[PDB]
């Protein structure tokens, strides 16, 4: 009968072990005990991205954003989902928003967000080149 916190911590351990479906299931159990914690959903979204399930990740980003509209990770993971779906303008907007929010919040993710923006812009440009 583990607590929500214990379940999140177990999920995190499984994530370290690269056991992504197991980690995601654990975050689901945490959500069952307390569904009002945005971090459970962004953690699970990351698992779904690693599992190549952007649709499931996107839904979790939406749940996260309803609880925490300022979530840097929700915007970033949303952008990644949208890139997989070939929705480039949306993806770039979400990555730009993640960058802006991280700055406002003084968070340090190294060059991760700018790197993602460059990938997104490169992919958008490639899509244009692929069609002419």
């Amino acid at each position: 009968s583990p607590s929500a916190q214990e379940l999140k911590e177990q999920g995190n351990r499984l994530f370290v072990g690269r056991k992504y479906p197991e980690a995601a299931a654990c975050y689901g159990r945490a959500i069952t005990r307390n569904p009002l914690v945005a971090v459970y959903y962004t953690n699970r979204a990351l698992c779904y991205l690693k599992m190549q399930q952007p649709e499931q990740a996107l839904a979790d980003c939406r749940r996260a954003l309803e609880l925490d509209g300022q979530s840097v990770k929700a915007h970033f993971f949303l952008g990644q989902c949208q890139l997989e779906m070939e929705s480039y303008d949306e993806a770039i907007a979400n990555l730009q928003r993640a960058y802006s929010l991280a700055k406002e919040q003084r968070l340090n993710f190294g060059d991760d967000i700018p790197s993602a923006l460059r990938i997104a812009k490169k992919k958008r440009w490639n899509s244009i080149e692929e069609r002419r």
Partner: peptide, 7 residues
């Protein structure tokens, strides 16, 4: 630190 980690 990377953004692709769990909290």
């Amino acid at each position: 630190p990377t953004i692709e980690e769990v909290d």
